[PDB]
């Protein structure tokens, strides 16, 4: 049964609620982004209206085979009427096609559902600037002050500089980047651009990337592994055994691997600066864990909420334990006392 924090009161709507069967009273199912914990339950047999971004609807049609007649893509930054209720989709600064949803209820209440997001000051000049928000359904993934990580730009600068140095020292080194979902495409695209290579990958991952409306993508990716010196592999294969096995397959074209695992936060964050990150090495294989996050840090989250000044916060992540819930509620109250709302 669908949890309360997935239901939008005063509407027929649910958000990211496809794994509960037919939800009683639901007339429209919104999907914030194409990550499996959120789309869980969707397939070609789904026959209710799904509302989403254009990019998410490309992925629903091509990857999950949802039939076209049930996919309702909406443009961003545009007031739309859905089953009698005004809604707006906003960029969530998460993965490609990810949105936040503004609902203007018939009684005058305004609700923001962030989906998954990485808060940014640029959001302070979107259509959120223009009216009051009563209720915030908040991505609280990293809602504790220990969660610090660098900007995405500092992390990509580190990756490009590391890869370019290694391959210029050894033109027979291969770069490998791990993936298991959409998101974080800048990691492998930025490294292939500095090396003058396309990114090589499986047919299934090429198909996924072709749904993303990324400009000039036909110039950047390929299924011809032999022509590429940046390869994409499943995240599970980014270990010494998996990489040794891959190097065998390349037929002596290469004699070294430099590999990247873009994680979110790891506790090497509470001690080490990005500049000081070092790899794990075994023989001619080195593996870097780089803290590339597509969710808010604690400080980015706190700034967004103190700017928005909502009347009520409903967390959507870390809700299953009483200790997590009590921790989050304490920070919400601190933020409200410090800012004065």
Residues forming the site for Ni ion (CB under 5 A): 35, 116
Shortest distance in whole angstroms from residue 112 CB to Ni ion: 17
Shortest distance in whole angstroms from residue 94 CB to Ni ion: 6
Shortest distance in whole angstroms from residue 265 CB to Ni ion: 14
Nearer to Ni ion, 160 or 235 (CB): 235
Nearer to Ni ion, 116 or 185 (CB): 116
Rounded-to-integer distance, Cα 30 and Cα 52, Å: 6
Pairing relation of β-strands 135-138 and 312-315?
parallel
Nearer to Ni ion, 114 or 269 (CB): 114
Cβ(53)–Cβ(74) under 8 Å? yes
Shortest distance in whole angstroms from residue 4 CB to Ni ion: 21
DSSP symbol at 23: P
Nearer to Ni ion, 35 or 184 (CB): 35
Shortest distance in whole angstroms from residue 114 CB to Ni ion: 11
Shortest distance in whole angstroms from residue 295 CB to Ni ion: 8
Nearer to Ni ion, 160 or 319 (CB): 319
Q: Where would I find the beta strands (DSSP E) of the chain?
A: 7-8, 13-15, 28-30, 50-52, 71-73, 80-82, 85-91, 99-104, 110-113, 135-138, 173-179, 199-200, 221-222, 230-234, 256-263, 280-282, 285-291, 312-315
Query: Which of these, 260, 278, 282, lies nearest to 268 by C-alpha position?
Result: 278
Sheet of 199-200, strand order: 221-222, 199-200, 230-234, 173-179, 256-263, 285-291, 280-282
Shortest distance in whole angstroms from residue 127 CB to Ni ion: 22
Nearer to Ni ion, 35 or 303 (CB): 35
Nearer to Ni ion, 6 or 35 (CB): 35
- Three-class DSSP category at 112: strand
Q: In the Cβ-directed half-sphere of 119, how many Cα atoms lie within 13 Å?
A: 24
Main-chain phi, psi angles of 325, to 5 degrees? -60, -45
Shortest distance in whole angstroms from residue 183 CB to Ni ion: 7
Continuous H helices in 170-235: 185-195, 203-210
Nearer to Ni ion, 209 or 229 (CB): 209
Rounded-to-integer distance, Cα 127 and Cα 101, Å: 11
């Amino acid at each position: 049964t669908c949890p309360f924090y997935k239901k939008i009161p005063g509407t027929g709507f649910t958000v990211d609620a496809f794994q509960y069967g037919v939800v009683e009273g639901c007339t429209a199912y919104f999907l914030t982004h194409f990550h499996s914990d959120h789309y869980a339950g969707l397939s070609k047999h789904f026959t209710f209206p799904v509302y989403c971004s254009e990019i998410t609807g490309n992925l629903l049609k091509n990857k999950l085979h949802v039939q076209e007649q049930y996919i309702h893509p909406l443009p961003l930054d545009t007031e739309c009427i859905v089953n009698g209720v005004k809604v707006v989709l906003l960029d969530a600064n998460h993965c490609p096609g990810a949105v936040m949803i503004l609902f203007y209820l018939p009684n005058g209440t305004v609700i923001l559902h962030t989906g998954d997001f990485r808060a940014d000051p640029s959001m302070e000049r979107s259509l959120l600037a223009d009216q009051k928000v009563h209720m915030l359904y908040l991505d609280t993934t990293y809602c504790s002050p220990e969660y610090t990580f660098p900007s995405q730009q500092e992390v990509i600068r580190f990756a490009i500089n590391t890869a370019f140095e290694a391959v210029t020292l050894n033109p027979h080194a291969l770069v490998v980047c791990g993936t298991y979902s959409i998101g974080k495409e800048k990691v492998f695209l930025a490294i292939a651009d500095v090396l003058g290579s396309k990114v090589g990958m499986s047919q299934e991952k090429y198909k996924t990337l072709q749904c993303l409306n990324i400009p000039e993508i036909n110039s950047l990716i390929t299924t011809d592994m032999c022509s590429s010196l940046v390869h994409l592999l499943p995240m599970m294969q980014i270990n010494f055994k998996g990489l040794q096995s891959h190097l065998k397959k390349c037929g002596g074209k290469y004699n070294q691997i430099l590999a990247f695992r873009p994680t979110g936060w790891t506790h090497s964050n509470k001690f080490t600066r990005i500049a000081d990150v070092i790899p794990q090495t075994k023989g001619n294989i080195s593996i870097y864990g780089i803290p590339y996050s597509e969710h808010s840090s604690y400080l980015e989250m706190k700034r967004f909420v103190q700017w928005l000044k909502p009347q009520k916060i409903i967390p959507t992540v870390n809700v299953g334990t009483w200790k997590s819930r009590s921790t989050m509620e304490k920070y919400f109250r601190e933020w409200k006392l410090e800012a004065g709302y």
